[PDB]
Amino acid sequence: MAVLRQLALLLWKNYTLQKRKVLVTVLELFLPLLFSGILIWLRLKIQSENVPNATIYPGQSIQELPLFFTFPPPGDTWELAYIPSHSDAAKTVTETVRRALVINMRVRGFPSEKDFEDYIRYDNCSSSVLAAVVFEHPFNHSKEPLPLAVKYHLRFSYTRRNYEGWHTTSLFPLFPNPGPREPTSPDGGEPGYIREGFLAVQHAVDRAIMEYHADAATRQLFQRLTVTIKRFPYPPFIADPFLVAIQYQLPLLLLLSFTYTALTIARAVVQEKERRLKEYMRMMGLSSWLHWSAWFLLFFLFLLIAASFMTLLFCVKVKPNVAVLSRSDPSLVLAFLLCFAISTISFSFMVSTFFSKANMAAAFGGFLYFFTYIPYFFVAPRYNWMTLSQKLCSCLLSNVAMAMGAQLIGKFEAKGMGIQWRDLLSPVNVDDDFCFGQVLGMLLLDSVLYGLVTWYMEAVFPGQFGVPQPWYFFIMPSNEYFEAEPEDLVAGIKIKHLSKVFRVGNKDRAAVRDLNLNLYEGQITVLLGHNGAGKTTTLSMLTGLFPPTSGRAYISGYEISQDMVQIRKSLGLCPQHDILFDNLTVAEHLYFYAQLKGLSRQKCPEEVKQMLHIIGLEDKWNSRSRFLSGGMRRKLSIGIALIAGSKVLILDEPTSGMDAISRRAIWDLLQRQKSDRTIVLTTHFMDEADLLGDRIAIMAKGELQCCGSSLFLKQKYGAGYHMTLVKEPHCNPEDISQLVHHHVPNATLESSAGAELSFILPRESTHRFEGLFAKLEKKQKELGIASFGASITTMEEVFLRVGKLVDSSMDIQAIQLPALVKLNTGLALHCQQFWAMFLKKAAYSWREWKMVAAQVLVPLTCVTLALLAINYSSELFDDPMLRLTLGEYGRTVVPFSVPGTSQLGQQLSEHLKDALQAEGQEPRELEEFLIFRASVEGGGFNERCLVAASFRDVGERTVVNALFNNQAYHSPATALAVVDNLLFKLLCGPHASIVVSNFPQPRSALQAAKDQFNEGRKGFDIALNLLFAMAFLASTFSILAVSERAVQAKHVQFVSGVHVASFWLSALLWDLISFLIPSLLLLVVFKAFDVRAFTRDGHMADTLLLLLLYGWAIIPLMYLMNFFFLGAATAYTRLTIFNILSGIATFLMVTIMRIPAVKLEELSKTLDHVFLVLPNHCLGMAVSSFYENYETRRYCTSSEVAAHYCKKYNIQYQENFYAWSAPGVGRFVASMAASGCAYLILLFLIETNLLQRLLPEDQDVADERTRILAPSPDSLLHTPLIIKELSKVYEQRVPLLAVDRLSLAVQKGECFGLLGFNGAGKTTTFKMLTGEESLTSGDAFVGGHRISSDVGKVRQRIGYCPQFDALLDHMTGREMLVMYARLRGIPERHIGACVENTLRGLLLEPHANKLVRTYSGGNKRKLSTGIALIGEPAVIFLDEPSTGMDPVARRLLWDTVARARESGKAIIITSHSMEECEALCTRLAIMVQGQFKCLGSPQHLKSKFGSGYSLRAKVQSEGQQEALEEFKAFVDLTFPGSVLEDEHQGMVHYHLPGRDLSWAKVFGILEKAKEKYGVDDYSVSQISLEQVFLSFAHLQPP
Ligand SMILES: CCCCCCCCCCCCCC(=O)OC[C@H](COP(=O)(O)OCC[N+](C)(C)C)OC(=O)CCCCCCCCCCCCC
Ligand SMILES: CCCCCCCCCCCCCC(=O)OC[C@H](COP(=O)(O)OCC[N+](C)(C)C)OC(=O)CCCCCCCCCCCCC
Ligand SMILES: *[C@@H]1O[C@H](CO)[C@@H](O)[C@H](O)[C@H]1NC(C)=O
Ligand SMILES: *[C@@H]1O[C@H](CO)[C@@H](O)[C@H](O)[C@H]1NC(C)=O
């Protein structure tokens, strides 16, 4: 009904906010197309062969060795050794082999395999050995027969003779191409077994062993039987290699396509939680799921455009039968991409509930996307073994469930099916039960399994602002101080016996006890309250955050505990912060919030038009919410608070941090806008709580203390008036105090600061004021008084006294109210600043240990875990055993036919069936049977069927064809093995056996030294592995340098006088010291793994130099790149990426642009000269070229033959390791040492600023100006500030005279004011005095030193308190004071005392050692102004010293700032609150448009620019309908010129004109008329200082 209205109003907002960011939207649609258009290129760059049918092979003979051993070698005859020599049984078996393979072979005999293994490698004639028969029996030394169980080797050459090794390490090819292993070569192929002569020798040895036992039947049997060998015929096949590369490039190119729009979801979701906008909407009625639904319906509808396009350009027939995923039903591709999209949205929602900042979440949730894809590189190959449950459990990571589904799209596409909606359940081959339905299901299950984690972490760990819930929440289904309240007005908030008690003694909040307040309509009520006393528990119960305990409170006739859902209809409210979306207009916020508050669509626009008028923003309409102000945003927030008609209106601190005009505008707004509604303020200013507030309430200990109007409270909780004089040089305070006390008895000389003399005249003696003022009017010149005045108490005193009567804390008991050394210089200074700046940088590595566990632990793992995955070797082995017998594979299945008509087949088939070794028999009925079978079996044929048998006798001759599966390496031997194994049991007793082996010969000395030299795939692979771990380390140096400049902490330090060299050469020293712990922990790793290219010789001190030279060259480059960034976490992720692209990309763009005359690219010589300025490409190409030189040297040294080979082929190793033009690292050392010195120079040339330099004015102002041009002989020598004829002109397209001649002279014991209008130049004068800005035509003498010449000796004598908080969160309350006591001098023996007394002067001792992050927002303003006062400064430049502080702590600070001025200093305040420029000032100066318009103490200003008085009388309730006008007529008769100006329920407020009214006459008149006209109380006061300041408001140029 209306939920559907909110769900669309909340979706228009998201769509608008998101399409206003053009670079992100356009970059989210051009990644998933740039990454999927690559496949179109890669497909049109590859063709498919697709043989028709019928590839079959002929047969070979194994009777005689190939026609290569007929010719003898250069040298002698061939050799054939046997290893058991002493045994005669083996001695005679080899001789029949010799007389069966007659060439000239000489038979040798050896003791044992040790002797042969030493003969082959340690000789020069041991090169013509052909085979070597080895047995497995001790043989009972001299004579013994051969036991019927025989095993033996043959053992061999090592490299192909007739023509790589024998591949005994493996058993199937590692990278199987599609098709036959050797399409040509109809006899075996690569491993040998035919060309070499393995089979001929094996058959001969088998025949020898047969004749050794039969010798007679053998001749008969082999007279009518010969054995040949044939290869399987291979079926017609698809030859396309691209379909094999779709199972490793599709998943990665899908993930890399969605991985950006998967991290702009986390940022968008968390950025709106960080700004507390979701918390604001949740307090208007919107539930917490309306936001997730509106995020989902946007990002899903936005990913469905990319998925459709991706589906389209996968499956468009570019050319006849092309277009990757050619026959694959595009609807199913789309329906799989949509499930991937839902999963990758629901993943980001879950990720965004772990972070508070938007930068961190965006950076570190775009990384977990990748990090959840890793376990697929370890499942892509090992896929045929895994059981179903393990495969299904691996899918709980959505990025892996997608990849195992992108593999099936290749495994189906390489067969002709090409998934078609009707095989969702059918497995792939016949036996691997894992369909394509369990991919979609596991993709849509992880969505829910992630929703269940976000819904729990959003409710139990809400963050900093929300309120948590119990972890099991898914279980339960659930006096005389009070004035008389008005009678005309109707209550709009009624509270009765409200109460709340919190949890166990872990209080941490504030309790209310028995509140009985009451708030009325058409009236502003101000709710004050001391520090711990309720007042935010109360405003939380009323606004609906938690229920009460023992009370009830009605808002608009409802009750907060029963039906809050209807209260929130009229209750509008605006908080402390700002609730506005940047990138929406002024006109859109109102149209959004008016309707969200439940306003009809047809009747909205006129209220938007009216509210744009009430606020006063007709112009500046449809401006973004950025670019407005700081002072029209507080007006738009107030506008939102009361749009659509809202009765109750709870707004707090509405005028915080605003100048004095934008504050009166808001006051006037709120005064015109009540009239109908109840407003509840709460402020920290104690005159805003008085000027606009008609009824006030104060809470002290969770219990309402006093209530009533302002005049009611002031007459009850305050002392008398505040009469103030202005004494002159020839004056005596003693001669005036006698007058005052002798005339009025009770009084108090409150203070005599400056030249004021203020008293306290109690108000229970107002009948003597006639005499006092009449008498003191006369003796003006005789006494020395000029322009006195009087006023009544303030509201700060009332507030401070109420809480003092009913509290006992340490602070509130401190306030008092009226009752009832040579600084260092030269060398010590610089060496002291160096230490101070070194400790600051050092103490960050162990108070934030995320940088130690990421400088020491990331490089180590990144280097070891990826040396493991390479299997770094440094050693070579010698091709181990491989027993040639069926069974190392597994349970096979062996067919055999009997296409015979005669005998010699049946007995053989029965014996074969008696194998019972591996598989059964699987008899068939051959050549064509295999062709048919090898099309429906698929991969099963090449895993369960390796051999065959076919006994086809042509009458007498009985051939036995044995077939071998070429897809294996060692099949042609196993086939003959089984064939002759059974044919030997034929003419023997079947209790025997024959197995053999392969186990090739060991390498010689000259072969190992060449098979070790061809490990060139190690330098290039160990350089990339290290360049990738030095990019997660080089970036951690620009984090303190970014987060210190962003918080403005660097600006204050440079103002206080730190040197541009001590600042940076002290960061560099520590960043080099912190570049050895990893740089020395890498030697341990390279030693443990034994990487010899740089461990063996004195090279451990040559990698260390190469790593120090890289640290030295990249640290200063990472210092320069910090000037781009503002957040410490958007710089890490943008600088590691810069490192990786500057490194890997441009180092890999040179090695593979030099491939052995393939892609030519002779310009690599130019690229490797243009890339010599990047210090990552200079490390990669130095490590690689070190590892290469050492290898090619260690080779061309082992023997002379190698040296000759190197000479012929021009290998050119250098023996210096550091020379030029070589494999030596000379031009890389020399280019990293000269690049780290061209960055320091450029850093200092940026810091030291070599870019920006490559008319009746007033009587008192003129008096001041001409008092410092013609001074007394020594009138100005002991004074701090002597500004003289100071000016500054801009050149921004028009001469702007922002300062005009500014002649002033501040003295010891002063406190200058310097007020001004917005843009009057009060903020360039401040800068120009603190040394920041360029001067023009005039000087200033700060302490004795000119400000145009010696601007370095000045900065050591001035303190400076900024407006913002420029503190270093990793330091301590006391360490930050020690830092600044060192940057200024203060010999090391005094620092203890100078810090100890300051800390307890500001009352910071509890928090002295507390790590300034725990500090409340008001203990930071107490420390920023202890930093200003530490040391002995000549001048102090305070600037809004107490911004966000409550009244008690603010008073306690204004006290110290004045106790520091009593004892001979000079202060310069500059603030926006006119309440603070009176509590600590001695002389003021309003400044408009260029220059001073007035000057003098705040009383001399009120006399000279004041107008008159202001009455505030009230009349009792007796005849209020009759006495009010009777009094109101009298005050228009006896005071000609009054203005009524206000009226509220008992009271008036006049503006009695000051023309001809003494301070005596006005009191006599009212004191006589008090009783004759029935008045309850009254109070006369003079003009207010802020009202005097506002008089000059018309002098603004616009
Ligand atoms: C498993 C399948 C799916 C899993 C996805 C869902 C699980 C997500 C877990 C990952 C996040 C772990 C929790 C986490 O990050 O804590 C938050 C802080 C960031 O703080 P921050 O963002 O300032 O605000 C805190 C948010 N709050 C209030 C809710 C705690 O976290 C940090 O501060 C970031 C940590 C700094 C980097 C760590 C580097 C130190 C050493 C590196 C580790 C060993 C080196 C090899
Ligand atoms: C498209 C792919 C993009 C991703 C590619 C590579 C990006 C690397 C992801 C990790 C980035 C984490 C960023 C980070 O930790 O910030 C450095 C911290 C910030 O501390 P802090 O000053 O509290 O942060 C405030 C700044 N803020 C809010 C904007 C973050 O300052 C520190 O305290 C030092 C911590 C730095 C060490 C972080 C290194 C750990 C990364 C490896 C994590 C592996 C987990 C097993
Ligand atoms: C080859 O070996 C024989 C002994 O077998 C030895 O006499 C001869 O010096 C060797 N030749 C060379 C070149 O070392
Ligand atoms: C092998 O023959 C020897 C002949 O000297 C004899 O010790 C025994 O019969 C056999 N030895 C072993 C250890 O079986």
Side-chain angles (χ1 to χ4, degrees), residues 262-281:
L263 70 85
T264 81
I265 294 181
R267 202 214 312 279
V269 169
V270 183
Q271 172 187 358
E272 193 207 45
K273 172 177 76 177
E274 194 197 11
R275 302 198 284 207
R276 325 179 52 152
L277 284 158
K278 188 184 180 177
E279 188 208 8
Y280 179 70
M281 279 165 209

Side-chain angles (χ1 to χ4, degrees), residues 783-797:
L783 274 170
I785 298 144
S787 72
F788 66 105
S791 64
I792 199 159
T793 64
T794 59
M795 192 61 94
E796 199 199 21
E797 170 181 356

Side-chain angles (χ1 to χ4, degrees), residues 119 122-126:
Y119 181 76
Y122 293 5
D123 195 286
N124 54 9
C125 75
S126 74

Side-chain angles (χ1 to χ4, degrees), residues 138-142 144:
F139 274 105
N140 299 107
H141 54 105
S142 297
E144 196 180 10

Side-chain angles (χ1 to χ4, degrees), residues 347 350-351 353-357 360 364 368 372 397 463 850 853-854 857-858 861:
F347 176 72
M350 178 190 73
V351 160
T353 78
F354 294 107
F355 299 101
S356 287
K357 287 185 138 150
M360 269 278 308
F364 183 76
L368 290 181
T372 309
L397 301 196
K850 307 290 98 176
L857 272 67
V858 161
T861 66

Side-chain angles (χ1 to χ4, degrees), residues 607-839:
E607 292 81 3
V608 175
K609 197 173 42 64
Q610 291 176 352
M611 187 65 49
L612 276 171
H613 192 198
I614 288 175
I615 317 161
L617 276 159
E618 320 290 9
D619 53 278
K620 290 290 276 287
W621 181 65
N622 76 10
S623 313
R624 307 280 182 86
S625 285
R626 42 173 44 184
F627 317 143
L628 285 175
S629 284
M632 271 175 308
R633 295 169 65 199
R634 284 306 308 165
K635 262 171 69 185
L636 180 62
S637 307
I638 289 179
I640 293 168
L642 52 83
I643 191 51
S646 59
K647 304 330 287 174
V648 191
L649 192 152
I650 304 186
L651 60 83
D652 81 21
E653 296 180 357
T655 61
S656 198
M658 278 186 320
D659 57 357
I661 295 175
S662 298
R663 185 174 176 269
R664 295 312 207 102
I666 287 174
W667 286 14
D668 177 19
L669 196 160
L670 284 173
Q671 283 289 110
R672 303 188 265 95
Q673 273 298 120
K674 38 181 200 179
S675 194
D676 189 359
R677 42 164 64 98
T678 70
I679 295 171
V680 184
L681 281 161
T682 187
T683 57
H684 273 164
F685 306 132
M686 290 296 120
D687 62 349
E688 187 181 12
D690 192 10
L691 271 173
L692 60 83
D694 308 343
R695 182 166 174 266
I696 311 186
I698 311 172
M699 315 189 56
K701 272 197 172 180
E703 189 177 6
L704 183 63
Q705 296 282 156
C706 74
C707 186
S709 63
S710 81
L711 176 57
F712 169 87
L713 288 179
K714 287 206 206 151
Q715 167 266 301
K716 184 159 308 289
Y717 270 120
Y721 284 58
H722 286 328
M723 193 260 297
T724 297
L725 312 190
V726 174
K727 58 187 177 179
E728 293 179 353
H730 50 289
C731 182
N732 288 320
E734 60 177 359
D735 280 300
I736 294 166
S737 178
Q738 309 181 22
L739 193 148
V740 164
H741 278 240
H742 160 277
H743 183 75
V744 57
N746 323 294
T748 315
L749 172 43
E750 181 56 350
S751 69
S752 62
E756 292 295 323
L757 277 178
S758 60
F759 297 83
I760 306 280
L761 317 170
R763 71 181 302 164
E764 41 275 40
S765 70
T766 60
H767 45 267
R768 318 212 70 81
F769 287 18
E770 181 86 350
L772 194 155
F773 285 98
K775 175 179 236 172
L776 188 149
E777 184 57 275
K778 284 292 151 33
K779 292 144 292 304
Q780 276 290 73
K781 315 152 290 282
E782 172 185 347
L783 274 170
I785 298 144
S787 72
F788 66 105
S791 64
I792 199 159
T793 64
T794 59
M795 192 61 94
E796 199 199 21
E797 170 181 356
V798 178
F799 169 80
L800 291 187
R801 172 164 272 128
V802 161
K804 170 180 278 320
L805 301 172
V806 183
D807 208 322
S808 308
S809 279
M810 183 177 37
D811 51 319
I812 316 173
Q813 285 312 318
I815 297 169
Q816 63 284 300
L817 304 98
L820 288 175
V821 66
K822 199 159 180 89
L823 303 188
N824 278 1
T825 292
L827 196 79
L829 175 76
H830 284 88
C831 302
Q832 191 175 5
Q833 308 188 353
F834 192 99
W835 187 238
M837 282 299 126
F838 179 87
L839 272 173

